[PDB]
Ligand binder design. Structure first.
Ligand SMILES: O=C(O)[C@@H]1[C@H](C(=O)O)NCCN1C(=O)c1ccc2c(ccc3ccccc32)c1
Lengths: 278, 278
């Protein structure tokens, strides 16, 4: 009915963590979420499978459901991740919302201009942007540091990279063309490989999503890996809930999220799921 | 399409200076060689024309150019940001910039206006143009751990702390019953404006000033007898304020997002907000 909402999310620890069902039911702090699971890699055939979801974003969804008073059917997106426009068709979580298969999307979904043209976003509930991680001792400010913009002006020249084909690289390509060209030979397969490169001295700085880097710094064995101060984050933005354009839920979601922030409940979820021992 | 803009004195976001004898604004460049864009802003001195510039004025000019509107700028008559108060009773009314926007004396608030639940109930905020938070300013040599210091949590008149009257910080301490003891202390001491509270810290008449970190860090970098303590104890953002029926809403928010993404906000923060540690 009008009060029961189709909601899409995406597996991405610690924001959304997916587990197998028990007892046939989802217990503890988990909620039901289903996934359309493909038969094989060469077909559109598949089967809906019952799962259990928990995490930072799931706790947010639970709070919203209680406060704003809606019920939901939660599913995991299967085509894409967060959302990219391919052949002028949106995939991922963004696509589910744009094409009306979900009323909202909840997850580590970054707010930007391109997506905002096709969905409405709640207020940000987690701050992010483009940040920089280094091993303690290494001296840089944020992305706009001349040491990044003109590495050859310094000795030795800085070695720094990102993960290819994501939003950080895309932003750098648009804003700092020489820096982008310079970084290509230092780019990293993924976040894990980047952390090793830093720790083993093969890389001086790793440039990436701020929330991800803060999470990683929080749990670095030895607590030697650190991020720049939040004052230096470039292109500051946030993760937010995506709703359909003109959605009748947006005001209520927004007010609830700001109440949560105001009452310190947001700081509590961050301490629970995001803040590490470092 | 001629917008009445309301704003407020609040360095480094808004500087207010006398006009020249002929009623124009003195041509000036920033320390880095950028032209300082100045607009005539009328405000209380009775009402007189004055010159305004700074982070928020640059943002206004970019907005006005991108969305093709014209504007006249004035400084809020009561000099406050805005809280909601009981009148005499029954009715509640907003004061400050919030009141002017709601009554139609302004069509848009362009100022370091904190986004919170209380205000979002009645007006529309853009996505944040600045992410920051709350911190505490003291005279160098003053020792407090921060917001949970026993001299804050268990107040007496031996250690005086305050914020600005009728601001988001006032709202923050008033909204939580567990903060009622702190609030009872602060209301006895709250200042009319940020500048006066800051001066009072320098003069040793106020021992701790609780306020926006985007402002307090700038002040501590200009005035080395002042320091901030405890990092951020709360995170919040500034946004453009409009009435709920504004036709400009969507495009203002898109413009802000775009400006974070293309380095425009980075430029503004470097021109106005960024600072060398003492
Ligand atoms: O904006 C981005 O770049 C996207 C996405 C979006 O809205 O598209 N917004 C969020 C960032 N992000 C990602 O893909 C991304 C990349 C890597 C990790 C995580 C989340 C958790 C992790 C935990 C451990 C290691 C890596 C990760 C998300």
């Amino acid at each position: 009915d009008d009060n029961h909402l189709s909601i899409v999310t995406l597996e991405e620890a610690p924001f959304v963590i997916v587990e197998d069902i028990d007892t046939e039911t989802c217990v503890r702090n988990t909620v039901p979420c289903r996934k359309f699971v493909k038969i094989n890699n060469s077909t559109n055939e598949g089967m809906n499978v019952k799962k259990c979801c928990k995490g930072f974003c799931i706790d947010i969804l639970k709070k919203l459901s209680r406060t704003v008073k809606f019920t939901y059917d939660l599913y995991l997106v299967t085509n894409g991740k967060h959302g990219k426009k391919v052949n002028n068709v949106w995939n991922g979580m963004i696509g589910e919302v744009v094409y009306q298969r979900a009323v909202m999307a909840v997850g580590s979904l970054t707010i930007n201009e391109e997506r905002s043209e096709v969905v409405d976003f709640s207020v940000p509930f987690v701050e992010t942007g483009i940040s920089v991680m280094v091993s303690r001792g290494t001296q840089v400010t944020g992305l706009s540091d001349k040491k990044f913009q003109r590495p050859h002006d310094y000795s030795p020249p800085f070695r720094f990279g990102t993960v290819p084909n994501g939003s950080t690289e895309r932003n750098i390509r648009n804003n700092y063309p020489y820096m982008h060209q310079y970084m290509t030979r230092f780019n990293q397969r993924g976040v894990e490989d980047a952390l090793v490169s830093l720790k083993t001295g093969k890389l001086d700085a790793f440039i990436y999503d701020a929330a991800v880097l803060n999470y990683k710094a929080g749990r670095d064995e030895g607590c030697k890996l650190v991020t720049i101060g939040s004052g230096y984050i470039f292109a500051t933005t946030g993760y937010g809930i995506a709703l359909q354009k003109g959605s009748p839920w947006k005001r209520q979601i927004d007010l609830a999220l700001l109440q949560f922030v105001g009452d310190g409940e947001m700081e509590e979820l961050e301490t629970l799921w995001l803040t590490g021992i470092c | 399409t001629r917008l009445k803009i309301v704003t407020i004195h609040q360095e480094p976001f808004v500087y207010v200076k006398p006009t020249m004898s002929d009623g124009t604004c003195k041509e000036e460049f920033t320390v880095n060689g950028d032209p300082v864009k100045k607009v005539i802003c009328t405000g209380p001195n009775h009402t007189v024309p004055q010159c305004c510039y700074g982070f928020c004025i640059d943002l206004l000019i970019k907005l006005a150019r991108t969305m093709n509107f014209t504007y006249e700028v004035h400084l809020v008559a009561d000099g406050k940001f805005g809280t909601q108060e009981r009148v005499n009773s029954n009715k509640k009314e907003w004061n400050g910039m919030m009141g002017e926007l709601l009554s139609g004396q302004a069509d848009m608030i362009v100022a370091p206006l904190t986004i919170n639940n209380e205000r979002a109930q009645y007006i529309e905020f853009s996505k944040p143009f600045k992410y920051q938070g709350l911190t505490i300013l003291v005279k160098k040599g003053t020792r407090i751990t921060g917001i949970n210091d026993p001299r804050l949590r268990n107040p007496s008149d031996k250690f005086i702390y305050a914020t600005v009257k009728q601001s988001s910080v006032d709202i923050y301490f008033r909204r939580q019953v567990e903060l009622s003891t702190m609030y009872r202390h602060m209301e006895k001491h709250n200042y009319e404006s940020a500048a006066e509270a800051i001066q009072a810290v320098r003069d040793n008449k106020l021992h701790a000033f609780i306020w926006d970190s985007a402002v307090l860090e700038f002040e501590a970098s200009q005035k080395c007898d002042l320091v901030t303590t405890g990092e951020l104890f709360f995170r919040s953002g500034f946004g453009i304020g409009m009435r709920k029926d504004s036709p400009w809403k969507q495009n203002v928010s898109l413009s802000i997002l775009k400006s974070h993404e293309n380095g425009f906000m980075e430029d503004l923060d470097k021109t106005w907000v960024r600072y060398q540690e003492c």
